[PDB]
Amino acid sequence: SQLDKDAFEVLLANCADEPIQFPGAIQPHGLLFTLKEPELTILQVSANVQSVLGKVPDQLAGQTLDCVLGAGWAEVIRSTSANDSLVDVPRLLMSVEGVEFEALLHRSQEALVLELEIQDKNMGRMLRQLHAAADLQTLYEVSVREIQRMTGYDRVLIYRFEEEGHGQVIAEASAPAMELFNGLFFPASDIPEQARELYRRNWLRIIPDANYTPVPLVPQLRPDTQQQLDLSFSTLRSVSPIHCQYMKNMGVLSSMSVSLIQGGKLWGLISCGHRTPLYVSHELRSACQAIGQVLSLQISAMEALEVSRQRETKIQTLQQLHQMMATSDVFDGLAQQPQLLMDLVGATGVAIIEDRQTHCYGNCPEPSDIRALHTWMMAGGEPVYASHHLSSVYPPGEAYQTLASGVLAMSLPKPVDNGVIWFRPEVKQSVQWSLRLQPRTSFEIWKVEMTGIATKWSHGDVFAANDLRRSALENDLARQVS
Amino acid sequence: SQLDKDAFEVLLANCADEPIQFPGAIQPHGLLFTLKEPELTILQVSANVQSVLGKVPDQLAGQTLDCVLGAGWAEVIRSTSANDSLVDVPRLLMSVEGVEFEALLHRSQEALVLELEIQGNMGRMLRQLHAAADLQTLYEVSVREIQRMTGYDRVLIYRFEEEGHGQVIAEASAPAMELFNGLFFPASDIPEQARELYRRNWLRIIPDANYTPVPLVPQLRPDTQQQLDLSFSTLRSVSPIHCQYMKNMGVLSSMSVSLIQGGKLWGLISCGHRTPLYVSHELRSACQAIGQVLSLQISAMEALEVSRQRETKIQTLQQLHQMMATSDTDVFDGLAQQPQLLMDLVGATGVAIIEDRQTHCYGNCPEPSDIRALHTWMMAGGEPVYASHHLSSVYPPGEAYQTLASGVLAMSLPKPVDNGVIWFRPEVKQSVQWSLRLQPRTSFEIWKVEMTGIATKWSHGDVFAANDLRRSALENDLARQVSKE
Ligand SMILES: *C/C=C1/C(=C/c2[nH]c(/C=C3[NH+]=C(/C=C4/NC(=O)C(C=C)=C4C)C(C)=C\3CCC(=O)O)c(CCC(=O)O)c2C)NC(=O)[C@H]1C
Ligand SMILES: *C/C=C1/C(=C/c2[nH]c(/C=C3[NH+]=C(/C=C4/NC(=O)C(C=C)=C4C)C(C)=C\3CCC(=O)O)c(CCC(=O)O)c2C)NC(=O)[C@H]1C
């Protein structure tokens, strides 16, 4: 299939900005209808419907639901929709030719979009177990454990989305015969922003098969709209061939994703993976969604504990810090307890510039390196830095990324010989793991993507730094007087 | 007749300090065994064993479980208890002489206390709770679906104010039955030991009201004093005071899900049922999970609530700045040109702007000559803020406006001719409107005297908002101080 292969290549030419909200195709495990709500007249119908219902989608276009779905059920659908907002609709189940379809209704472009998903013919204790978790890591462990336990899926993962966008596999429950994924990082380019919008606006994305031929959805433009059909809010969609082949080369044939949402933001993704195709029942579909609606609230509540404790120990930090500031230069005294400065931000590497021998601690490059690094701090004038990239401001400084890649540095406003640099290395060294569209390849792409880019600094973490400079800006006048 | 009444009257005198952490008795719907940790020798046994099992309870002390629980089941619970810390324990169902007991194990004072209790929609429920947009709507759906699953007639949710009093914020009453929405009862209605036991655990269950507690024998702890710690035990005697309280209501079965915002008792979901009924283990955990989930939502959504107020408060202060700047005669009198905006800045009902003998009042406040003394009494201390939960408690002659002006907060710059931006609040007696010995009416009536002259509490943000205006008033006057040119 040479003619198919090169035609697939042109798809890979552009993927960051590709129309995926309006593919014009749906997965073959259901039916799709686009109607005018008051009369329930068909505007769009997929080509899958030929294999289950009347002849051709074009003839059904422009007609009423009373023909395709028969009588009685049409009036039932009209009664259920009525004038309701279509929020928290009860469970519906239809049977047009002995096949049971779950009917999910929503409204797009003032049109009734109805998805007939084909369906083939404990919880409190687990919530208590989630509540019993004392830290975030144990929470992740128990959540993935029970999800893999009851979902029945061979592989269950969870990614957390950093502010930079490169997802991190923070936990897993992999069964034997799949590779481990703890600490794996994949670039944000692996998920287009349109797919991110689709994930955030929904709560559950299911792809039961990654080896399928998308079915046409004709007419591609609505007769009364002359524009593409919004399929964002439909479970029955078309999977892009690029991520389809990604799944094929990832070993995953059936996948799920529970979009963990915190305050309108996509905190992460409870993902799955299964070589044998599996069709998920709605009862378990809601339970997994109920996990995300609870766990994301539980996670945000638990980091709300963590962000309080970390901020709390930051508050105490300057309390014991300032006692040694008052004991005896101001930036000279902080070097006698280097581990106390580490916990203020989580630097994993610190150094204090003083006189000539810049007394570094933890891990740190040679003095010939840090000396030619802090010069790009005080010329700008900013007392603090949020430097994921080491060499964004200092181009030829790529020789420090072995140890020094994230520079949130402070100093006294003294123009000469001051500073206490908190080096966070590249995330590449922190996590050790292990053709085209491979998890191995995206790891390699991430290595170039992460090259020189370090771990993100929290706003409070920079604030907690600013207090240390402010605390050092308190007793200096007392030090000057004394 | 009089003999029973004689005992109760002595009990009613010392309810505020009564030992309910060590009742010495258990409810008749199960058994309790306190054992030595390594050998499982019966250290304490309830008197109900002569009925549940038939063996005398006076004896059997200091002997292994083999007499009652056999050897195989004793070994099973030995394996379950040992090296587990009892953090997460699966369901243990035992069958002694054809009777099924659900086993709950814990440890108090280094002894194994074992309690033998005689024996799809969750996803939609969680989705419905998460879909709530407002706190009142959240309460309504919570109580309505709790009444939908649990067969208990009345379902209420009390939100405990920081003062200590409980109010029924939402209620799902059965048709043709008493209505308690908007009710208030005092803090003394629930003792501090009871509140500690509520916050320590998650559920309190009283299957039957008119019940005779069955005591423990031997009563005194064989090891040390302080008796048996029945604080983490689901099976525990109910004090006759609250017992007759429930009996008067007509409700004989009572559920109670302790809503905990971390380590604080935010409130209680109470299911009152007029007919005795059971709970079942599956429903017991589902109700507990609802309280754990709902308290997560309240804690999360309350943060949404205050942030909305914080955004509204911050925006108003900059909004008031534009109004304040346009004034040409008096900064605070100019602030009175938009009084309805001033009311909602801090949260209040009456607002008074005080000029020289001209109290530019707006809303519900006394006539100027009465709160004049309150304005001068502020000058007695010169406090930047005067957040007062109770007015008559601090200001003696507060009865002249105790009905309407009880919760007072104000602020003013130090000036020769002082002003006021007093933010009154009516006593919550006026806000509440609801229809002999232990009744909600007398509880409401005893609450009315208890909460006489006390309005709702001022939050930290409310007190903070007054300072921001005072900073703005200082800053606006600071610009006014230079604009004499
Ligand atoms: C610019 C185009 C690209 C792309 C397209 C694409 N990706 C997704 C969604 C992905 N891709 C994931 C990639 C992974 N990274 C890993 O480390 C692993 C496995 C260990 C995988 C699979 C990924 C996790 C997602 C989210 C799915 C989930 O369930 O978590 C989409 C959206 C597909 C859809 O139809 O929803 C598209 C179109 N693939 C590329 O390789 C880049 C170039
Ligand atoms: C000083 C002692 C007293 C006391 C003791 C007591 N009360 C409780 C628990 C109660 N009592 C409640 C009473 C109500 N007040 C109302 O307004 C209504 C109804 C509208 C009721 C029922 C009440 C709500 C609780 C908390 C129950 C819950 O929902 O969690 C106890 C604890 C008993 C136990 O075993 O749990 C005690 C000891 N009652 C008094 O009236 C005063 C004198």
Numbering used by the authors:
A (entry chain A): 2 to 122, 135 to 341, 344 to 449, 465 to 512
B (entry chain B): 2 to 120, 134 to 449, 465 to 514
Paper text:
Phytochromes (Phys) are a divergent cohort of bili-proteins that detect light through reversible interconversion between dark-adapted Pr and photoactivated Pfr states. Here, we present models of both states for a dimeric Phy with histidine kinase (HK) activity from the proteobacterium Pseudomonas syringae, which were built from high-resolution cryo-EM maps (2.8–3.4-Å) of the photosensory module (PSM) and its following signaling (S) helix together with lower resolution maps for the downstream output region augmented by RoseTTAFold and AlphaFold structural predictions. Pr/Pfr comparisons show that bilin phototransformation alters PSM architecture culminating in a scissoring motion of the paired S-helices linking the PSMs to the HK bidomains that ends in reorientation of the paired catalytic ATPase modules relative to the phosphoacceptor histidines. This action apparently primes autophosphorylation enroute to phosphotransfer to the cognate DNA-binding response regulator AlgB which drives quorum-sensing behavior through transient association with the photoreceptor.
We then defined by cryo-EM a 3D model of the full-length PsBphP1 dimer as Pfr by analyzing red light-irradiated samples. Here, 4,796,622 particle images were extracted and winnowed down to 1,029,141 after 2D classification, which revealed three similar but distinct EM density maps representing unique structural conformations of the photoactivated photoreceptor. Two maps resolved to 3.1- and 3.0-Å were dimeric head-to-head arrangements of the PSM with only short S-helix extensions visible beyond the PHY domains. The PAS-GAF regions were intimately connected in the dimer like those in Pr while the paired PHY domains were either moderately or strongly splayed (designated “medial” and “splayed”, respectively). Both the BV and hairpin conformations matched previous views of Phys as Pfr14,15,22,25. Much like the high-resolution Pr EM density map, these two Pfr maps lacked the HK bidomains and much of the S-helices presumably due to high mobility. Importantly, the PSM regions of all three maps (DoD, medial, and splayed) allowed unambiguous modeling of both protomers as Pfr as judged by sufficiently resolved ZZEssa conformations of the bilins that aligned well for all three maps except for slightly different tilts of the D rings and by the presence of obvious α-helical hairpins, which are both signatures of this spectral state. The Pfr maps presented an even more complicated picture where the three divergent conformational states seen here (DoD, medial, and splayed) implied that the S-helices become more pliable and possibly even allow dissociation of the HK bidomains as inferred by the conformation of the “splayed” Pfr model. Although the data for the DoD form provided structural appreciations for positioning of the HK bidomains, similar data for the splayed and medial forms of Pfr were absent, suggesting that the HK bidomain positioning is highly dynamic in these states.
